[model samples]
Target: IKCVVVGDGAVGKTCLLISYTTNALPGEYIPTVFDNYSANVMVDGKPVNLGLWDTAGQEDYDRLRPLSYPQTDVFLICFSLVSPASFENVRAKWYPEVRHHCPNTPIILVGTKLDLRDDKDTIEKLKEKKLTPITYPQGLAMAKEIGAVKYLECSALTQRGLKTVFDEAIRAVL
Candidate 1:
């Protein structure tokens, strides 16, 4: 039942985890100091344990990145709709990185701040900020290409898709 949420800094990883696990909204926007959180539950008439790991997004903690995989059951890779670079990195780099360590683990790609996407053009503009504009739909298209089994778009602040992610993750374990 362990679920590890990974993404670049300021990607709303902590907020999403809190919303999903505790049904409580965290007002802070800071990244976690270490890289992990723990939650316990009972599901399907059985005891369930969860360890939600949040790896440091900054390169300074790159050395500790590999440790996130050994015990994780589900990998939740998050990205912002307004920051396409993060989206690209998740597909282009993070997925492969996780796959290298936990090849069989179920990796879910989540698009955060969906309420802030505004319009398709804004998403395209965000992508253009880095390189060619792939468009928002195109970014999602790439996620599928990169092997993400499921995609969810939500605003962690609003607790959107929070329950769905957990349900899906738990479903996978079953």
Candidate 2:
């Protein structure tokens, strides 16, 4: 089994790529130590070794960005729930994916759009602000940093404001 990770997600892209391709599989909630090695990773006598790839979330991982994206096994790029750029970059191929040409792998889980895009500013005289309100296109980062990750924007919400989580997530490994 070969797998990889980073953060965040969305599903619509799933609909598109598969529209073109013709196959696949995945699984999440893994042993974070999914990296350990000992016994052969086999199933039903099928000899196999699982490789759990890792991507560091930093500017270093940033430069290594365009590093080696050749038909990647899969990638788990991310974005904030109420953010913008990551949505764009991941799509625009902003960073880089080590491709001689382009992103050909089936990238699923591109999200946060579902919850924040056009949710409720709900006609209540307004709600509170652990972080504040929303957008997709027009709203657009430090907002960008929220993409590569800022001083702690990712941390802020992750630690507070309804603390969220979420993924099937294993949908990455095919």
User: Top model by lDDT, which number?
Assistant: 1
Top-TM-score structure, candidate number: 1
Backbone N/Cα/C clashes per model: 0, 11
Q: How many collisions between residues are there in candidate 2?
A: 11
Over 48-146, each residue of candidate 2 has an lDDT whose tens digit, in order, gives 444434444334445564444444554445555454445455545433552233445433323433433344653121244343333332223322432
At residue 140, give the lDDT of candidate 1. Answer: 69
Off by over 4 Å in 2: 6-52, 65-72, 93-103, 112-174
Q: Cα miss at 81, model 1 (Å)? A: 1.1
Per-residue lDDT, model 2, residue 40, is 31
